[PDB]
């Protein structure tokens, strides 16, 4: 089992860098405004008849552009979820959805969060499937590469002011990286059997001689771009435990290798950008070390599971409650480490589910702030904050002004470093502290004992770092639950992004200095072990105290 | 006003792209290509249709091959629900759960043996698993040949049959898919 | 200054004294510092839940609430005591050399021309502009810029040192800092400076100055434990309701004690030491700086620009030769050469007319009223002549004779140029000394390297830093020069355009730029260098636009700049990091002593096998604010520097420091407890 | 939910206020 474990994390990181090196490559000549062969023309075409006269703008302008992008995204999503019934695309009648509702499942999936407090079978209909909860599944991914587009054109550009183009970056991006690809996993999720069509909800006269409602719907090509830009937002109530959502094996890998592709993608073109593949390969090398040693510890924890279950009269201790029998507990936990260290949050098994150590690791990689392989964009933005206090103490402590690829990192960048990493663990926390003050926080709580609290933690962690993934336990249809959870996602997407934002506005300015001799390498083995090192202490000095009462109280218990 | 033509030219030419080109030509593309897939993979006898070849349903019947218990909403295997019992480790509803279904399936099944496979006791994530392993399957043997007079060799062969390896082992795990194979046994006595 | 190293740190003589400023720090001077100031307010906050708790309050364990607020105070008392300390060694140090002004005796001239006046004018009501003559064996009252007479003063006490340093009349040794002793003959000093703003006053404001502001690097240092403080504030604050569900809450008492184990009081409680303490070191290395800011700019030095007359060299240069050429006899060999160089105030100059005369009695000419005009020596134009009468005597080096004067048809031959080669082999500066379209020959000036500089260019090199030469003087003795100091390279025949350009070429490539320059010529070079070091024995135009002003006349004072500024920061970085890592002792010590009652199970968490609870927050609050008081030689002497790669450093950096904050506290938790439980206080 | 509950969070309120502030001004 041990060796099935290793084989199968070897091959996963194998094709996922196979895969993602084209692909950093492609998505370089995006970053350095370069378009993409057999782009131009259609793209002039395209810009002139959209008044996009791609011109460079600022970091407040591109910023300005960001989020009235996702506002505009907010309203037009908001009212077309209270007003679904006037909507066509309706076989059933579902009414509109509540105000709690409606913009909980809005900010959500404008903040790339995709979190359901809803059933989508009985929830949602075609058009709001359609038309919206993917339209916004591609923005947001998109405005998560455009912010890191802009981050990485900041530490390559000389002394200049303006980062980009925002409307060219998010047209490029949505086009020709995220529609063209989402495409062929569409098709391969249609060939290996999840659904795609506008049918009606089909009745069925069983073998036995009962009767079940099957759900239809465009689920694949909703499938295809959760699974592209680490959105979450499953089709029905279950994400990829649902057959008609994940049907194979092999759909599911695909599903992983689109999870990562993307966010293994950026750092190969943030080194390939700056002319150092190093600087990318130590980013690659930085989260893969944390990743494989949480997958291996998720799926020991799995393979140990229930203690019980060996006493009550089964076979193994095995824990395959909650678990799809189409995936062992050694994918359930790879799957289930991937999609909460990389904030997409859709789930093929149930992580409440999880025995406690096995569910504590996913909790403090969406706590760390995601960036271990982490969301698209944020995931290296994200880690890009670490590594900007790595490089301060490095600095520091070996006697140098601190700097990151020539670029000195002074005191502005350093209070905006400071606020940006400083939002999300200050939103996890205070989220979670009125949920366990209030009776109606607390009586979503389904498990007793310290499992509770485990998730009403994990459920805010979800929403604050842009996971949406749910013990699914916690009843979050209340609306207290779904006004703190958007008011978590809408913090813990633009109050990082805003001081990102201002960092590659102030990093433009700059110049980099020369590499000199005396200069720290921000490569190798040693640099690579100190971000690691920052991150992994970090994260867990302020979550210790937390995750004590829940999951390691549990496990102690 | 304000630089307002850009952002609202940018938001709907996606708009219009995300949401009725590129569902738009999925659904042609799959309809035109894989319409059985695209459309439920459902199995029709006749003019009715028995469910379909990924959901699964909730087979009671000493002469059916019984599945993973289901934790949705209302009835077993209810597809408008799709979800999954989130008891946890520590929880000792689950642990009542367990011993619950241990004790109903040691009564049903009292030739086999008495460890009960994880599978039959554990319910599944999404509460619509069609399938189960190829032992857990074949620890049913003794009862669904007793029930419908066939024989162990049958079985297997059947079992055999309608068992799907993945394209490597470690990615997966072998499956029976039950819904299939219980249509076969009613071919098969009928 | 260098003749007593350092003062002690525990001489039990300030430390009673900068004990009794701790307690003047307790009250709400706190406010500048975020951390301590969130001690001082959880401090404040168990005393009162321990008097409450006395008196009516619901819980009843008030001796454990007082134990905890009492060390929690005692936090508090080690940083401001490591704080006082700092800045009272500090201020000794300033009053070691704050009472050099102790006499005032000081003749205001009202004609500058030795003598016809005689006052008693105290030293406080000189101005700038005010003409001093001073005897010898009397004090110099006034930073001032000598304008008359020779003489070997003794600055000691500035310097420390006991050689006596010589002082001319313009050139490079014009300026002399008051408040010390004459030693020779006299001399006619015009001050320049007002009361107030003189070089004592700029290093008692660079030492004894309380309100020192802080430099970027630890602003930026103090951003990121605010940031620390904020997030340990709110996981701590937040364990209050998330085990009030679960049983019984834990105590305020205990979050209180938690939360100042967690924020990083080690290195809060210290930043506002290590740099007074880096001040105080750079004063005992004698270098005056404006501000720590341009001391920490040391660290990112990687090239350096030196003289070669006054900071390499001695700056004297006096010699007497000959020239062996066609046409000069005895007489002709320095019958020009006096004649040029009468009027002429520059060391070379009166060296020789005191060398070249004596030779062969050529002491024919009377004072210069006599039908002579001269003009003044002038870098732009690297001459120092005179018409004295039809005829013209010029003093040039190699190219200025030659654009100046040679251009007018009467070239000058080559068989001079050889005898010029052979004086600059030796190392001599040559200058040429023509008489119109004639030229008479050249002349050598043998200058003296100072010292064995040799190994610390050798360190220099060590250090990753380029030392690179710059002078205005001929390529050939130059690189004779550059050859026997051992220096990288060199840059020969600079006009002070060509060392600012030089400057600003070095900096547009993205490096630091370090100058030790000493002469007004240098002025705008360090006026835009990163870091300007300046000569003590230079000029006031010098001393006033570095950045930095030298004291003992160390050419070669980059190392000990750049390894008290890169201390500064090695010091802050290790501590930041041990202060981080200390946060995993102090959870496995609070964490099952904190959830003993609510989570019984957590007490496996227990590695350190505590004895108690309350006697594992004891120990971690104890060992909390007795790492302070054992790390205060730390702060105060910083890291021990090794110049090695900035990949080794880094390495030897986290092995000694960031394992020492993740094993020791487990050690001295231990300690505590062991010794708690022996004392049976517990 | 006391007053003794209600006088910490304002008190935590009123300590990361403070600490916000100082963190963005350059005391
Ligand atoms: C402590 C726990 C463990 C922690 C460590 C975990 C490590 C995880 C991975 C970390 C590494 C990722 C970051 C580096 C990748 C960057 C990409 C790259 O260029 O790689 C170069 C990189 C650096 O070398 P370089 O020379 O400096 O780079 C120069 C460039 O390569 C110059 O370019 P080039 O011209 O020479 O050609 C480049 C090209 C060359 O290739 C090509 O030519 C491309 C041609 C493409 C044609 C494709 C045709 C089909 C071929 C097959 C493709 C399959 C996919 C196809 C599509 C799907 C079809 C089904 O390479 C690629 O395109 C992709 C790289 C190939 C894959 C490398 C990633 C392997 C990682 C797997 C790790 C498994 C072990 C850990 C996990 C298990 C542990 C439990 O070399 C590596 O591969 C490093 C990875 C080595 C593995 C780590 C070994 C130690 C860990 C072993 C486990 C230890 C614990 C054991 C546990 C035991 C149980 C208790
Ligand atoms: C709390 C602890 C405090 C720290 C205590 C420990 C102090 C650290 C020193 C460790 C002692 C060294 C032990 C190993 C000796 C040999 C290793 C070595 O190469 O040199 C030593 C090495 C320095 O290397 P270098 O001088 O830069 O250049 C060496 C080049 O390789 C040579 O030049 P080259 O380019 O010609 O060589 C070519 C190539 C090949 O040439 C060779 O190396 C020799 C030939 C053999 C070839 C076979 C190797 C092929 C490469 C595959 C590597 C597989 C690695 C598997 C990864 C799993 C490792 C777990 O070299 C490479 O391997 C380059 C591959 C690219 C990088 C690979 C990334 C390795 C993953 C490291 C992950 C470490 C995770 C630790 C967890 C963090 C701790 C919490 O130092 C380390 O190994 C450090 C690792 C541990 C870091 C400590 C983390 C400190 C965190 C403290 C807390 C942070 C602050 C918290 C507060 C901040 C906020 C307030
Ligand atoms: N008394 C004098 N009369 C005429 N020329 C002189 C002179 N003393 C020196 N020179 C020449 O003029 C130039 C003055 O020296 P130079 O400017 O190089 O000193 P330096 O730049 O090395 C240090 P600094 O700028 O502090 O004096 C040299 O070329 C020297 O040969
Ligand atoms: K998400
Ligand atoms: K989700
Ligand atoms: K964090
Ligand atoms: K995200
Ligand atoms: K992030
Ligand atoms: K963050
Ligand atoms: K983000
Ligand atoms: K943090
Ligand atoms: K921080
Ligand atoms: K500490």
Request: proline share 4%.
């Amino acid at each position: 089992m041990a060796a099935q474990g290793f084989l199968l994390i070897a091959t996963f990181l194998l094709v996922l860098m196979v895969l993602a090196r084209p692909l950093g490559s492609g998505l370089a000549r995006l970053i350095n405004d370069i378009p993409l062969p057999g782009t131009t023309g259609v793209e002039r075409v395209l810009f002139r008849a959209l008044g996009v006269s791609d011109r460079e703008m600022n970091w407040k302008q591109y910023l300005c552009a960001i989020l009235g992008l996702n506002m505009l995204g907010l309203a037009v999503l908001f009212f077309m979820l209270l007003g679904q019934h006037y909507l066509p695309l309706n076989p059933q009648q579902l009414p509109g959805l509540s105000w709690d509702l409606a913009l909980n499942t809005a900010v959500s999936f404008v903040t790339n969060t995709n979190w359901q407090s809803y059933s989508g079978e009985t929830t949602l209909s075609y058009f709001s499937q359609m038309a919206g909860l993917t339209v916004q599944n591609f923005l947001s991914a998109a405005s998560g590469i455009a912010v890191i587009f802009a981050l990485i054109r900041a530490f390559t550009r000389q002394s200049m002011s303006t980062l980009g183009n925002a409307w060219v970056d998010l047209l490029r991006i949505t086009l020709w990286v995220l529609v063209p690809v989402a495409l062929l996993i569409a098709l391969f999720f249609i060939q290996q059997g999840a659904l795609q069509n506008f049918l009606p909800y089909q009745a069925v006269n069983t073998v036995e001689g009962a009767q079940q409602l099957l759900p239809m719907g465009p689920v694949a090509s909703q499938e295809a771009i959760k699974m592209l830009g680490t959105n979450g937002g499953g089709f029905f109530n279950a994400n990829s435990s649902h057959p008609f959502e994940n049907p194979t094996a092999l759909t599911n890998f695909v599903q992983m290798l689109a999870i990562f592709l993307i966010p293994t993608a950026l750092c190969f073109a943030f080194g390939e950008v700056m002319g150092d593949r190093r600087q990318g390969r130590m980013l690659l090398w930085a989260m893969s070390v944390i990743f494989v040693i949480c997958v291996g510890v998720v799926m020991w924890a799995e393979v140990q599971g229930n203690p019980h279950l060996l006493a009550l009269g089964t076979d193994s201790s095995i824990n395959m409650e909650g678990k799809e029998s189409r995936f062992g507990v050694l994918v359930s936990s790879l799957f289930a480490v991937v999609t909460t260290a990389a904030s997409c949050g859709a789930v093929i098994a149930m992580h409440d589910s999880f025995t406690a150590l096995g569910g504590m690791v996913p909790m403090w990689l969406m706590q760390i702030g995601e960036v271990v392989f982490g969301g698209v964009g944020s995931g290296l933005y994200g880690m890009m904050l670490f590594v900007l206090l790595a490089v301060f103490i490095a600095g520091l402590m070996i006697g140098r002004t601190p700097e990151y690829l020539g670029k000195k990192i002074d005191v502005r960048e350093m209070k905006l470093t400071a606020l940006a990493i400083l939002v999300t663990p200050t939103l996890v926390l205070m989220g979670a502290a009125l949920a366990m003050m209030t009776d109606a926080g607390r009586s979503a709580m389904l498990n007793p004992g310290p499992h509770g609290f485990s998730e009403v933690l994990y459920a805010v962690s979800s929403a604050a770092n842009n996971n949406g993934s749910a013990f699914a336990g916690l009843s979050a249809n209340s609306p207290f639950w779904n006004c703190l959870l958007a008011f978590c996602m809408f913090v813990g997407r633009f109050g990082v992004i805003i001081p990102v934002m201002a960092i590659a506005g102030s990093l433009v300015s700059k110049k980099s200095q020369a590499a000199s001799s005396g200069t720290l390498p921000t490569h190798g083995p040693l640099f690579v072990g100190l971000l690691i090192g920052t991150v992994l202490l970090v994260g867990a000095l302020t979550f210790i105290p937390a995750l004590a009462l829940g999951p390691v109280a549990e496990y102690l218990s | 006003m304000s630089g307002l033509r850009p952002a609202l030219s940018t938001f709907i030419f996606l708009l219009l792209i995300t949401g009725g080109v590129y569902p738009l030509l999925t659904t042609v593309l799959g309809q035109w290509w894989f319409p059985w897939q695209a459309n439920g993979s459902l199995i029709r006898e006749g003019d009715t249709v028995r469910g379909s070849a990924l959901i699964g349903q909730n087979f009671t019947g000493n002469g059916y091959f019984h599945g993973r218990p289901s934790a949705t909403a209302e009835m077993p295997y209810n597809p408008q629900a799709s979800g999954g019992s989130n008891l946890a480790v520590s929880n000792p509803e689950l642990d009542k759960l367990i011993a619950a279904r241990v004790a109903a399936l040691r009564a049903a099944n009292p030739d086999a043996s008495a460890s009960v496979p994880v599978e039959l006791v554990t319910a599944s994530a999404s509460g619509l698993d069609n399938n189960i392993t190829p032992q857990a399957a074949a620890w049913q043997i003794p009862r669904v040949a007793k029930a419908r007079n066939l024989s162990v060799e049958q079985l297997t062969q059947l079992i055999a049959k309608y068992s799907q390896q993945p394209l490597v082992k470690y990615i997966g795990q072998p499956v029976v898919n039950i819904v299939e194979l219980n249509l076969a046994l009613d071919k098969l006595d009928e | 200054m260098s003749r007593k190293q350092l003062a002690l740190f525990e001489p039990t003589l300030v430390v009673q004294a900068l004990k009794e400023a701790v307690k003047k720090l307790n009250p709400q001077a706190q406010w500048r510092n975020p951390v301590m100031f969130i001690v001082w307010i959880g401090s404040l906050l168990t005393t009162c839940i321990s008097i409450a708790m006395a008196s009516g309050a619901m819980p009843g364990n008030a001796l454990f609430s007082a134990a905890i607020s009492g060390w929690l105070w005692i936090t508090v008392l080690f940083a401001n005591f490591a704080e006082a300390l700092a800045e009272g060694r500090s201020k000794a140090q300033a009053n070691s050399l704050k009472g050099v002004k102790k006499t005032a005796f000081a003749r205001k001239l009202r004609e500058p021309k030795y003598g016809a006046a005689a006052d008693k004018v105290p030293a406080d009501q000189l101005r700038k502009g005010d003409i001093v003559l001073v005897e010898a064996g009397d004090i110099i009252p006034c930073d001032g810029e000598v304008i008359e007479g020779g003489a070997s003063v003794d600055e000691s006490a500035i310097t420390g040192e006991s050689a006596p340093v010589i002082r001319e009349s313009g050139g490079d040794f014009a300026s002399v800092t008051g408040g010390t002793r004459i030693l020779s003959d006299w001399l006619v000093i015009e001050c320049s400076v007002n009361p107030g703003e003189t070089f004592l006053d700029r290093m008692i404001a660079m030492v004894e100055g309380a309100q020192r502001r802080k430099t970027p690097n630890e602003i930026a240092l103090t951003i990121l434990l605010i940031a620390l403080t904020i997030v340990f504030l709110l996981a701590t604050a937040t364990l209050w309701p998330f085990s009030a569900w679960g049983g019984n809450a834990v105590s305020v008492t205990v979050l209180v004690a938690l939360l100042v184990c967690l924020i990083p009081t080690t290195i809060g409680g210290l930043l506002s030491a290590i740099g007074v303490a880096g001040m105080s070191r750079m004063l005992g290395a004698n270098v005056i700086a404006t501000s720590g800011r341009a001391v920490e700019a040391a660290g990112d030095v990687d090239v350096l620009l030196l003289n070669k007359t006054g900071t390499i060299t001695l700056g004297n240069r006096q010699a007497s030769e000959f020239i062996p050429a066609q046409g000069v006899d005895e007489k002709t060999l320095a019958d020009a050469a006096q004649l040029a160089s009468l009027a002429d105030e520059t060391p070379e100059g009166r060296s020789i007319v005191i060398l070249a005369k004596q030779r062969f009695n050529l002491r024919e000419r009377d004072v210069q009223s006599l039908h002579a005009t001269f003009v003044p020596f002038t870098a732009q134009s690297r001459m120092s002549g005179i018409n004295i009468d039809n005829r013209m005597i010029r003093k040039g080096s190699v190219d200025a004779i030659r654009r100046h004067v040679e251009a007018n048809g009467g070239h000058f031959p080559t068989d001079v140029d050889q005898k010029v080669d052979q004086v600059a082999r030796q190392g001599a500066t040559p200058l040429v000394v023509v008489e119109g379209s004639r030229v008479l020959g050249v002349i050598a000036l043998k200058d003296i390297v100072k010292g064995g500089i040799k190994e610390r260019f050798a360190q220099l090199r060590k250090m990753g830093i380029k030392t690179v030469m710059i002078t205005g003087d001929n390529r050939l003795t130059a690189a004779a020069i550059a050859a026997e100091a051992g220096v990288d390279d060199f840059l020969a025949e600079a006009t002070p355009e060509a060392k600012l350009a030089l400057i600003r070429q070095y900096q547009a490539e993205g490096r630091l730029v370090a100058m030790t320059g000493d002469g007004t010529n240098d002025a705008p070079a360090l006026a835009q260098a990163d870091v300007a070091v300046a000569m003590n024995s230079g000029t006031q135009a010098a001393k006033e636009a570095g950045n930095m002003v030298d004291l003992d006349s160390n050419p070669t004072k980059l190392i000990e700049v750049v390894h008290i500024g890169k201390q500064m920061l090695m010091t802050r970085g290790s501590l930041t990091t041990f202060s981080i890592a200390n946060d995993v002792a102090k959870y496995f010590a609070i964490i099952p002593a904190a959830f003993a009652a609510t989570y019984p199970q957590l007490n496996a968490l227990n590695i350190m096998c505590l004895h108690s609870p309350d006697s594992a927050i004891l120990s971690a609050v104890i060992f909390n604010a007795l790492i302070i008081v054992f790390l205060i030689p730390l702060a105060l002497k910083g890291v021990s520097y090794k110049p090695l790669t900035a990949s080794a450093m880094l390495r030897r950096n986290l092995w000694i420091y960031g394992l020492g904050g993740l094993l020791v506290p487990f050690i001295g938790i231990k300690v505590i407890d062991l010794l708690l439980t022996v004392c049976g206080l517990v | 939910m006391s007053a003794g509950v209600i006088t910490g969070v304002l008190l935590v309120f009123l300590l990361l206020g403070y600490l916000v502030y100082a963190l963005i001004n350059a005391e």
